[PDB]
């Protein structure tokens, strides 16, 4: 079937070329860019002990969750720089944390092969573990809450999995990736999702159907970063090849490349603003090189982190950008 | 408002209770001295030597691809590299894994303890007559002067184990930038825990000397 699989790979890449037309860099070249942003470090969220391997914001955009390999999980109050609900973790090495949209439940997960969910608003006022979602044979790398009871989890066993807290088991398993899957993103209309793995591919998924519908094979290296465009009709991924590229769901190809020749470092966290024309990508040169997101113009450098920025996310209403990094502090950007 | 002031007072009180908790288990955590092993989920053996915590991490359940979860262990005290010491060609897989760990841009800051765990298993294979074909420069290798483990040990076993040691240490010296140092060993061996203690002592000593730029 190896001879057969090359034929539909050649047929799909011609369907990209049949809809190649004009690229996004040529069309958007006429209109005015936003120019230089000059984001500044509003608030430094100090208190994490080891490297901050993962973070997530909230729908309320006030509380953010951030996960560090010390064994902690602090729901940071980003408006006043306050720590609320510092979860002590069973696993010392946590690589994911999704702040639940509703806000009641908080995920974690990592090398323990368990995505453990913590309910913040317990009846006793002390945060405990609701259900430990064991079942993955690989490391938990990204998690995203569908709602208060549904949580798809990216994992290192080449399979993402949709779980249910009420039963503690997998609703469905997404067995399409061929390498250990790194980042995860849910659409704003929460009907479908796309996850990036350590492949050349970041293939799209369906929540209710449970399996891959379209595959976006655009990066050279390990896609550590993924985030939808704010409509949900597109998404940008980021990998270790020092290029982050955007892909459209209605299309099938790479849109246009956000790369610069000075960048010789990997990408770990991409995130999108309220408007689509801004892309916050987090890099391995200890900075977050933000782009214009439509013109390959580096809109700014979010320097100020001494170690590698491993998780940068933006607020749901577009207020701020908080880039957690490996130097054990998050920083709020505006 | 007064209700806004009431919520911020409770938020600050919960924050200072959390700060008290995080000072307490910062005092726990900095005394932990985590290590990483190679060669469910992640396994924990919190062993104490000389009233010093050492929080070992066997990570066997993660699969063969390890390029992204080995980046968990750049802030670790040490990467205890267990080598099967016998040569699929599992020993050269350990050399390539050590070369991948050594030259990794995050693991450049953290040190590796090498142990060669199946050293007692190595003695039957080399005395029977099997690494000469598996390594061409073993013929051209010579034994160093500081190479006496024990007088009853055969010089062929000593030459083989020191060739395997400096086969890792060719990666440790001949490299680019990176602030980290290798501690090879030769292992029933009840002295291994002590060897981990002395090597992590020298690791955190060297980390403080590099913090003073003494290295």
């Amino acid at each position: 079937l190896r001879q057969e699989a090359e034929q539909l790979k050649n047929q799909i890449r011609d369907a990209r070329k049949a809809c190649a037309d004009a690229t996004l860099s040529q069309i958007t070249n006429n209109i005015d860019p936003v120019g230089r942003i000059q984001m500044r470090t509003r608030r430094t969220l100090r208190g994490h002990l080891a490297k901050i391997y993962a973070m997530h914001w909230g729908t309320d955009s006030r509380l953010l969750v951030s996960a560090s390999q010390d064994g902690k999980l602090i729901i940071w109050d980003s408006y006043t720089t306050n720590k609320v609900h510092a979860i002590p973790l069973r696993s010392s090495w946590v690589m994911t944390c999704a702040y639940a949209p509703s806000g009641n439940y908080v995920a974690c997960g990592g090398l323990d092969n368990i995505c453990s969910i913590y309910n913040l608003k317990t009846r006793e006022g002390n945060v405990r573990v609701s259900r430990e979602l064991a079942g993955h044979t690989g490391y938990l790398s990204c998690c995203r809450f569908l709602d208060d009871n549904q949580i798809v989890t990216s994992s290192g066993d080449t399979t993402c999995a949709l779980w249910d807290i009420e039963t503690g088991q997998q609703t469905t398993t997404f067995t399409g990736h061929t390498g250990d899957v790194m980042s995860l993103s849910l659409a704003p209309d929460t009907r479908l999702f796309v996850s990036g793995a350590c492949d050349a591919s970041a293939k799209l998924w369906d929540v209710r159907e449970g399996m891959c519908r379209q595959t976006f094979t655009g990066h050279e290296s390990d896609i550590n970063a993924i985030c939808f465009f704010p409509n949900g009709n597109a998404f940008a991924t980021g990998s270790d090849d020092a290029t982050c590229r955007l892909f459209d769901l209605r299309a099938d190809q790479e849109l246009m490349t956000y790369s610069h020749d000075n960048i010789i470092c990997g990408i770990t966290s991409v995130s999108f603003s309220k408007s689509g024309r801004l892309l916050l990508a987090g890099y391995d040169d200890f900075n977050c090189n933000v782009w214009d997101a439509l013109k390959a113009d580096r809109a700014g450098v979010l320097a100020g982190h001494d170690n590698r920025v491993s998780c940068l996310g933006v607020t749901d209403d577009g207020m701020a950008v908080a880039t957690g990094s490996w130097d054990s502090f998050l920083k709020i950007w505006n | 408002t007064e209700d806004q002031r009431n919520e911020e007072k409770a938020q600050r009180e919960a924050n200072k209770k959390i700060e008290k908790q995080l000072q307490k288990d910062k005092q726990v955590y900095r005394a932990t001295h985590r290590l990483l092993l190679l060669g469910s989920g992640i396994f924990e053996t919190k062993f104490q030597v000389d009233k010093v915590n050492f929080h070992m991490f066997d990570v066997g359940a993660q699969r063969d691809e390890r390029r992204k979860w080995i980046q968990c262990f750049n802030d670790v005290t040490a990467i205890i590299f267990v080598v099967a010491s016998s040569s699929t060609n599992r020993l050269q897989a350990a050399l390539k894994l050590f070369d991948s760990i050594w030259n990794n841009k995050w693991l450049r800051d953290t040190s590796v303890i090498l142990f060669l765990n199946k050293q007692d298993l190595l003695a039957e294979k080399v005395l029977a007559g099997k690494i000469e074909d598996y390594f061409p420069e073993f013929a051209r290798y010579t034994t160093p002067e500081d190479a006496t483990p024990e007088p009853g040990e055969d010089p062929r076993v000593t030459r083989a184990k020191y060739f395997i040691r400096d086969e890792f240490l060719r990666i440790s010296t001949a490299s680019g930038d990176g602030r980290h140092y290798c501690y090879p060993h030769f292992t029933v061996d009840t002295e291994n825990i002590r060897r981990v203690f002395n090597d992590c002592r020298d690791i955190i000593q060297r980390m403080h000397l590099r913090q003073y730029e003494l290295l």
Partner: nanobody, 127 residues
């Protein structure tokens, strides 16, 4: 698409020269450290050789160190591997394992099972 179409192999007598090549398109060849990994049936994935960017650091496994040489072509975007004086022990399935991150001197998981930047492979049978 990063696809890795290897070429070469076949029924070749031991001691006879063979040119191993992989197509290796979809990624920038000048940035990536490049690899060769073999896998015998019932043995497992075994690393053979690596070449760095522009051939700076070239190391070999000890089975083939005195008898193999590896070359790469940055302009033609193609990795090569000469084989000379073959014993019949290395009848393995050779596979042009590519290192995952380009600008890093390290190279993980090219002997890992179901690796994404590893080709389908060409059967190299010697008898």
């Amino acid at each position: 698409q990063v696809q890795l179409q290897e070429s070469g192999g076949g029924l070749v007598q031991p001691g006879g020269s063979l040119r191993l090549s992989c197509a290796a398109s979809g990624f920038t060849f000048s940035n990536y450290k490049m690899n060769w990994v073999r896998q015998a049936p019932g043995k497992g994935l075994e690393w053979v050789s690596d070449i760095s960017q522009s051939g700076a650091s070239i190391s070999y496994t000890g089975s083939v160190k005195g008898r193999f040489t590896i070359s790469r072509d940055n302009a033609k975007n193609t990795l090569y591997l000469q084989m000379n004086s073959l014993k019949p022990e290395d009848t393995a399935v050779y596979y042009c394992a590519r290192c995952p991150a380009p600008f890093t001197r390290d190279c993980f998981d090219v002997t890992s099972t179901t690796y994404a930047y590893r080709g389908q492979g060409t059967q190299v049978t010697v008898s």
